[PDB]
Symmetry: D2
Subunit: 293 residues, 4 copies
């Protein structure tokens, strides 16, 4: 994974994110309205919650939420990193359903009133640009001025490598490898050295170019090839998505969807959207909630 934060002008913030894996990971888009009651897990002692906000989920294998953006502009991305039970399939949605800002996610995660059941670490950004890194004891790191976030190593060891290369100068040398530190240093440098703009369509084009450079070429094997990329427009509530083999990039506009209590669940089958561009709201079909694995 490679997660980039682009802060344009006029409070415009775009969060890029690319999925790198040796095998294709079937991921579909699900739009959930408010008022839905979900369970934390299927084991004994699991708790429930009613979704306060509506959100769109990038559900991999139609079983677990890899990432998502809610109607408040809150974005949470899950990245690989080598008490009441809280499954990983609904952990991202539980924070999206109940919280509106990054600070609200930090307060709930600081309580740690849950257990979790090859692992992951998350990055949470709100519409205000406040971004943190959550890594498991739970450790919440404030990104501050950092813009990129990949897999390994941990965040303290990552910022050390970032500060080491920042003294060398990105204008002079950057690591061109596919390793997570190499992709993080490149993405962080480019995120600081691109022009800030107020146009939402241009900010996604700029964020796409940074994520493209930090992307692993497809079928790379001498095998974490980039499978797909996502870009969240936090100010305009647009969630972009594209498969690296498809011909068009499309977005789901939450401001044009019915997220009220009682609305039906919509689903975008990405396997049937190979040539779709522009807004993909009309291609959302009324479906049932995905079954947690």
């Amino acid at each position: 994974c490679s997660r980039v934060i682009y802060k344009g002008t006029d409070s415009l913030t775009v969060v890029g994110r690319s999925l790198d894996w040796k095998t294709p990971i079937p991921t579909n888009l699900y739009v959930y309205p408010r008022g839905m009651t979900k369970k934390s897990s299927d084991a004994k002692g699991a708790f429930e919650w009613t979704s306060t906000y509506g959100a769109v989920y990038a559900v991999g294998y139609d079983g677990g939420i890899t990432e998502g953006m809610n109607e408040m502009g809150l974005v949470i991305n899950g990245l690989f990193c080598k008490r009441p039970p809280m499954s990983l399939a609904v952990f991202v949605g539980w924070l999206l359903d109940m919280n509106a800002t990054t600070q609200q996610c930090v307060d709930v995660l600081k309580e740690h009133n849950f257990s979790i059941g090859s692992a992951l670490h998350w990055g949470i950004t709100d519409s205000t640009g406040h971004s943190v890194v959550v890594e498991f004891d739970i450790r919440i790191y404030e990104m501050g001025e950092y813009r990129a976030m990949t897999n390994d190593p941990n965040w303290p060891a990552m910022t050390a490598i970032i500060d080491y290369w920042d003294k060398i100068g990105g204008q002079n040398m950057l690591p061109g490898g596919v390793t997570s530190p190499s992709r993080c240093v490149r993405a962080n440098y480019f995120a600081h050295h691109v022009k800030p703009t107020a146009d939402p369509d241009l900010a996604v084009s700029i964020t796409r170019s940074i994520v493209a450079d930090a992307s692993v070429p497809y079928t790379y094997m001498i095998l974490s090839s980039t499978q797909w990329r996502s870009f969240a427009d936090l100010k305009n509530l647009r969630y972009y998505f594209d498969i690296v083999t498809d011909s068009g990039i499309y977005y789901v506009d939450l401001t044009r969807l019915d997220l009220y209590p009682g609305a039906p669940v919509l689903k975008l089958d990405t396997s049937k959207a190979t040539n779709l561009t522009g807004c993909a709201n009309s291609h959302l079909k009324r479906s049932a909630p995905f079954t947690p694995m």
Copy 2:
């Protein structure tokens, strides 16, 4: 700018190409049929030729052919080279050949890369800064680099090399590529936007991706290689932001094209067009088509030959 050659399986060759420049360069796609008589230049002593093969051109400013692909699978891409000097004292007088139709003259009259080598070796012309060097690849995968060293056409066989950027010249570029090859691309690669760095990365990844006989998958792989070698848009702090990218499918005769700010990538299929002599010239305005994907032969409208 980066030019990548992808050789899949079953004689499938895809030539990627990205245009990197500070300001946007208006580029439109033109489809020329056979039997068209064109002029090399407007100066005294220019010669004429009748196009033997139909080709699609990527004409910049609607005045000069940047790159193109003919109906035989021959692809020629023009890239900048700062130290290019086109004429000397022995080229003085040889018929003038403008850079606006230089790529088209090699595409209209030649079918293979070797035919382009035989014509360029004669060097019976002069060239009239658009200091550029070219990479020519035919459907069989044979690729060469053409550079002007003070009025001297220097042709190099790419052989196992897969990438081709700007400066320095090809011999010094091959040395930098071989130097980094011993270092190990899996261990370390240059991650800058300079021409050698982009050439070393795109050459390494072109060798370490899976070859395939799928024409669509081959294009998707070439896109990912060119995307990594592409300079991020609005890179501020010469050859700056990547403005557009093109991918030519040599076996299936498809010429892909996409603007980095556009939302879709489309292609022009030459096998589904009337390439007989006398056919109308077709133009694809890349400024009008913004959300177009798949085959772009639809939005091809009838236009007139572009004016050099």
Copy 3:
């Protein structure tokens, strides 16, 4: 500044170090015997201690102990660290310890690296020029001591062999671990910055042949330290290496050479009188521009250096 640890065979351990600075630092060697009463500082509340072990000190400006090696094989090396903060709110009121005699205090009373860790873990002193130390005993056990805002952070060097300046040891090991995954045989950072010098020295220390020859182990350590040594008259507005030191921990030999001198010499502590009442010896390095071999005959009787309290 760079610090390299070499572990050959038969418990042979050599600790190499190079001093990098813009201007030349006058450094003289002093040999102190046992039973010398010294003051931790000149301020109020300073304590005193009697030297348990005889040692050799590399005293810069003849007023402060940069590094040293006691007769037990314990070596302590002080290296600059920009982010070092010695005192905080919890250290105010503790007995003052001057940086001029801090290295000698640990070398006088302690014999192993663990004994220094226990003494530093108590932290019954306040320090009164930001540096961090590397301590190695005859057995090869080595640690890194850093003051993180009035907090003695002690890290086990473990399998790491090198130690330069900035950043701190956790961030430094993260850079070392990143480059180790690239492969030193494939690519190494060749700059004069502190992380680039540490990765090179740590790699080469692991990939040289271990030997039991005390003279070969020093020559091998010299080649690694010289590789991490900044060329002379080169500076950055991380400057030139002024001198290099090498300590043979098993044989109690302390090698020394100036980068501009034509020879390297060593002080053999086994061939010196360190009993209580022995005189303090001094070796003026400015007068040994062509001295090679054992330099015990050149040490002259001298009064103890005056610490710059």
Copy 4:
């Protein structure tokens, strides 16, 4: 192996040279006077010179009494003879140029004739004026390149491909990043960068110390191939320094204080006995016989 060129002020030029090999190479110093008739055709030595003779059978490098310095470095792709190419043995090829020539321009004129046939290696020649070139055999043809602004010289690849790598790393800026490996391009880039950024002086002793610090930074650690010995030639003062990496001292031979007239004896310095020698080693130059060429 690395060859560094240091130009101080007041026409002061020092050429450093380190020998890197997996096994130690016995190299002794031989001071040859003028008027000696040697065999390749034959020639009578015009100038006296000191020779770093490896295995006591071949001249590795050397400096003549005119300030001309020639260093020999290994090269993997060197082919000496072809179909177009008197036999000239490599054991005396360095001496023949040092005996009959005084300037770097004189060596280029003689080698350009190529009236002779020749361990593949290439050479770097520098005269007292600072003019330096690189001589390489490319499939029988002799290629002579002007070093000009370049200061370092190692092994492979050839000089054109080496200057491209140096120029490639020059754009990055040595103050930012340098290649830290032990490969020939990495060592040549580091030595060239530092040779442009050390303060040049008129002090001949400070020049050799600065030149040593550059060559020592470009030397491969011992037992890692491993650097065996380093040499430094002071062109203006006619001093040839020499030290073994495992020894404890660095000594030199001062040609200005030696008898090089026709009829003088051949002086040999056994480096296996000067383990603790520093300063001028002229007094330790014992009289001996000319070495036996391989």
